[PDB]
Amino acid sequence: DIWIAVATVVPEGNNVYYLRLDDGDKLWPAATNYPNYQPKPNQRALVNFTILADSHYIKVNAIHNILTKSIAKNEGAANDSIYGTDPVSIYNNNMWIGDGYLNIYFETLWGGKTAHFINLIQPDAENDPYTLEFRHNAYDDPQYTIGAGRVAFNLSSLPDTKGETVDLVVNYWTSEGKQAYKLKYNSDKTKMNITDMK
C-alpha cells in the first residue's frame, strides 16, 4: 500500500510534476499532502506514496528532496583541500545507478556546527572518464554522532557510452582507507581516442 522510493521529479508547469522511478515507471500525482511543493528540473527526492490506480496515479504522502548535484570541476592538486578527505561509510547496495544518477546513502560523523560539502569528481576525465571519486569535507565540524545522508549525482556529463555498458568505478575514503565500488553504466537509461576504440 505504502511505498518508499527515490524518484526523479519531472516538472511540467507551475507546481505540476510527475515522478520517474529508477525502473523507469512514471507516477502521476492524483493527490498530495504537499500541494505547495516546488518541482525543479533534475532533482531527486525520497517519496512516500500510495498507489491509487495501476504509468500510475498516486497520492504523494510525503516528499523529501535529496541533495542533487552534477559532477564537480576537477581542481587538480587542490582536490583534497577543496573537496575534503573526511572519511565516510558506504555499505554495498547503498550505492546504485538509477535514472542516470549515481545514488548514495552514506554515514559519517556530524556535530551540528558546520555544513559538510559532498561531491563527485573525475580525477582524470581524459584518460579515465568512468573513474570517479566521492568526496566529503566535514571542515571543522565536531564528530559528536553518527548520522546518515543521501545524495544523487547527475551522470549525464559522462562521455556517451553509445548504447553499450561500461564499468564505473567510484572511489571513496573510509576510516580504513581508500575503497572502490564498481557499477555497470550505460548512457542509454532504457537498457539499464579512449571511447572510440577498445
What is the Cα–Cα distance from 52 to 69, expressed in whole angstroms?
A: 32
Q: How was this structure determined?
A: X-ray
Identify the sign of the CA torsion 98, 39, 4, 180.
positive
Question: What residues are paired with 8 via a beta bridge?
Answer: 20, 44
Is the separation of the CB atoms in 116 and 141 below 8 Å? yes
Is the separation of the CB atoms in 151 and 67 below 8 Å? yes
Is CATH 2.60.120.10 the right assignment for the domain spanning 1-65?
no
Supply the Cα-derived Rg of the chain in whole angstroms.
18
What is the Cα–Cα distance from 111 to 75, expressed in whole angstroms?
A: 27
Q: How far is CA 89 from CA 8, 108, 127, in A?
A: 25, 6, 28
Contacts of 124 by beta carbon, 8 Å cutoff, 6+ apart: 74, 131
For cell 507551475, the residue is 14
The DSSP secondary-structure symbol of 89 reads: B
Residue 109: helix, strand or coil by DSSP?
Answer: strand
Q: What is the dihedral of CA 175, 170, 5, 88, to 10 degrees?
A: 10
What is the Cα–Cα distance from 187 to 161, expressed in whole angstroms?
A: 5
Q: Which of 66, 55, 13 is nearest to 30 (CA)?
A: 55
For cell 538509477, the residue is 98
The ranges assigned to domains in the chain are: 1-65, 66-198
What is the Cα–Cα distance from 54 to 70, expressed in whole angstroms?
A: 33
For cell 547496495, the residue is 93
Q: How far is CA 46 from CA 6, 66, 185, in A?
A: 5, 7, 22
| Helix (H) or strand (E) segment spanning residue 150 | strand 145-154
What is the Cα–Cα distance from 142 to 83, expressed in whole angstroms?
A: 18
What is the Cα–Cα distance from 135 to 14, expressed in whole angstroms?
A: 35
Instruction: State the fold for domain 66-198.
Output: Immunoglobulin-like (2.60.40)
Residue 81: helix, strand or coil by DSSP?
Answer: helix
What is the Cα–Cα distance from 29 to 74, expressed in whole angstroms?
A: 39
Domains 1-65 and 66-198 share a fold: no
Q: How far is CA 118 from CA 59, 82, 187, in A?
A: 31, 11, 23
Residue 76: helix, strand or coil by DSSP?
Answer: helix
